[PDB]
Design brief:
This is Sphingosine-1-phosphate transporter SPNS2. GO terms for molecular function: sphingolipid transporter activity; transmembrane transporter activity. It is found in: Cell membrane; Endosome membrane. The protein is an all-alpha fold. The protein folds into 2 domains: about 190 residues, Up-down Bundle (Growth Hormone, Chain: A); about 220 residues, MFS general substrate transporter like domains (Growth Hormone, Chain: A). The protein is built from 18 helices and no strands. The longest helix has about 30 residues. The chain is globular and about 65 Å long.
């Protein structure tokens, strides 16, 4: 029965992971004002972390089993929590030192972000495995919303990032203690070239990458769009959106669980197709939101409410597909390399690409705030098309999914 406790504590640790990733997506303006610094510094403080984590994902991948794992998970939680505990004290004299501070969480949390699913896989059988994996990825948006929640709570309470930068790391040390005592102790180039030759897992990686692109660009750029709307329609409600994202990620993950439960009795091709239709519908919603901005406010973000929840209905299924396809001896490298592909092709570049094409279109003609609305909407139309391409990638996996899950069982034999 102790496995249930293990799943619970890993899930809570993962929630802590995503909370302290997304926190500085909702207190960014305060620190920007405090250091008296440009927006490119903000781009640094939310991009160098992505770069560090994306490059150090494999350096724990090839570390898939090369040492005892429980120490790796405890080590990562403690070291990165101390990093943020330290960041809660840095002075005004130096800002690029804060850049490196919030960058270091990347390497220092690759630990929890890559290792943990492998323990989830080793520690369960199919049914409880997928249930606990569902909650374990429900971790993500829960912490997402909770990030903007912490930002709103501090800005309501005290106008300073000091009281928002210490709420997490204490919980971090708590999960460190428990994660060390409430879980059991359970060639590179050649193996990599062998891994790459798989022909479906690559498609799944591309797909999840496009999804991450979507969600990162969304998270950065929707609230400014809402600012533009409410200016046209004549803040704190943005972090009420943060809560909305929390609960709607809860809704999306339970939708994914129910969908796979209902369609498992159907053909095996359904689950990649389940995610495919999840992408199709979400993309359609985020396609229409741009004109729905005239109406979604009276509906209180109604369009995106279902859009991002339907989009967030493929995390767990993606993890399950990877769980099956790769050999357990290279499962860690599989997940880390997929995450690397996710950040490289996708979410990392989204802010800059949208902003740069948007500046292009704005510079094309005369500028008005309503024209700013129209132009940024026209530019952000790039995301829905990218994710419908991601959806047809899920389709291509599904058509390939029969013989490719056959290859997966072959790898199980291998």
């Amino acid at each position: 029965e102790k496995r249930k406790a293990a799943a619970a504590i890993l899930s809570l640790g993962n929630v802590l992971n995503y909370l302290d990733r997304y926190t500085v997506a909702g207190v960014l303006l305060d620190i920007q004002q405090h250091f008296g610094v440009k927006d490119r510094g903000a781009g640094l403080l939310q991009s160098v972390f992505i770069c560090s984590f994306m490059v150090a994902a494999p350096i724990f991948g090839y570390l898939g089993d090369r040492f005892n794992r429980k120490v790796i998970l405890s080590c990562g939680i403690f070291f990165w929590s101390a990093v943020t505990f330290s960041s809660s004290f840095i002075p005004q004299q130096y800002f690029w030192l804060l850049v490196l501070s919030r960058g270091l969480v990347g390497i220092g949390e690759a630990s929890y972000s890559t290792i943990a699913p492998t323990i989830i896989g080793d520690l369960f059988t199919k049914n409880t495995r997928t249930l606990m994996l569902s909650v374990f990825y429900f971790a993500i948006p829960l912490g997402s919303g909770l990030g903007y929640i912490t930002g709103s709570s501090v800005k309501q309470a005290a106008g300073d990032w000091h009281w928002a930068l210490r709420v997490s790391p204490v919980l971090g040390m708590i999960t460190g203690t428990l994660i060390l005592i409430l879980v059991p102790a359970t060639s590179w180039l050649r193996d990599m070239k062998a891994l790459i030759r798989n022909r479906s897992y690559v498609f799944s990686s591309l797909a999840t990458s496009a999804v991450s692109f979507a969600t990162g660009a969304l998270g950065m750029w929707i609230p400014l769009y809402l600012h533009r709307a409410q200016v046209v329609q004549k803040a704190k409600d943005s972090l009420i959106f943060g809560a909305i994202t929390c609960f709607t990620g809860f809704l999306g993950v339970v939708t994914g669980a129910g969908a796979t439960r209902w369609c498992r009795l159907k053909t095996q091709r359904a689950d990649p197709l389940v995610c495919a239709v999840g992408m199709l519908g979400s993309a359609i919603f985020i396609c229409l939101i741009f004109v729905a901005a005239k109406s979604s406010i009276v509906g209180a973000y109604i369009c995106i409410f279902v859009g991002e929840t339907l989009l967030f209905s493929n995390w767990a299924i993606t993890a399950d597909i990877l769980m099956y396809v790769v050999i357990p001896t290279r499962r860690a490298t599989a997940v880390a390399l997929q995450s690397f592909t996710s950040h490289l092709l996708g979410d990392a570049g989204s802010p800059y690409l949208i902003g740069f094409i948007s500046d292009l279109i704005r510079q094309s003609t005369k500028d008005s705030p309503l024209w700013e609305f129209l132009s940024l909407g026209y530019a952000l139309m790039l995301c829905p098309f990218v994710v419908v391409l991601g959806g047809m990638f899920f389709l291509a996996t599904a058509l390939f999914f029969v013989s490719d899950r056959a290859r997966a069982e072959q790898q199980v034999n291998q």
